[PDB]
Amino acid sequence: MPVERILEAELAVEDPVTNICQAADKQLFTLVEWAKRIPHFSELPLDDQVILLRAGWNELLIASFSHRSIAVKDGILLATGLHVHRNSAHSAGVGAIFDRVLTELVSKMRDMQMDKTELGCLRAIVLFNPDSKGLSNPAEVEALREKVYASLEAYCKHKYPEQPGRFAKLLLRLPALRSIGLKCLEHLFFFKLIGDTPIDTFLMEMLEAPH
């Protein structure tokens, strides 16, 4: 599980609410291509690949746009190229969750200058979620996750030796990512219910019930 392959995966794939949902649908296609470039993912059974992506797609995409936004002041950069300021998000009725992303993810990524290898490793940990329901062999996904965080810790110790707490600092952003992912899903289901926000085919499929 070499960190070089994980970094290569990141580099290979590099009403505001309506724009956000359009960017999210676009990035779902690219997310599948990213996962295929993480070591050993494509060797899992197809049903397990589906389970892992349906379980992690929203956290995976939130981590990505948050890190893309580190040089944006008080805003985010959509994958479509549109900058969205927090004033625009508040004026559209999603100010609270937008501020959570800025304060708990973007600003904290900026403050520690989280790099793209660390980002990719955190996303690979999220992808290899052994708690995902229905996996044919959870122990093998657990083993892949363990390989990722072992490689990440060694990377942090080699590249940032004067920061012994950095590995723990990276992992302790995952509870915030989990909570923000769940809250974003609540909003999307509500937009779907109200019907006043376009939702494209792949995003809509991710909002479908599982089989």
Added chain:
Amino acid sequence: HKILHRLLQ
């Protein structure tokens, strides 16, 4: 899961 399966080929 139709789109997701097709993309995972």
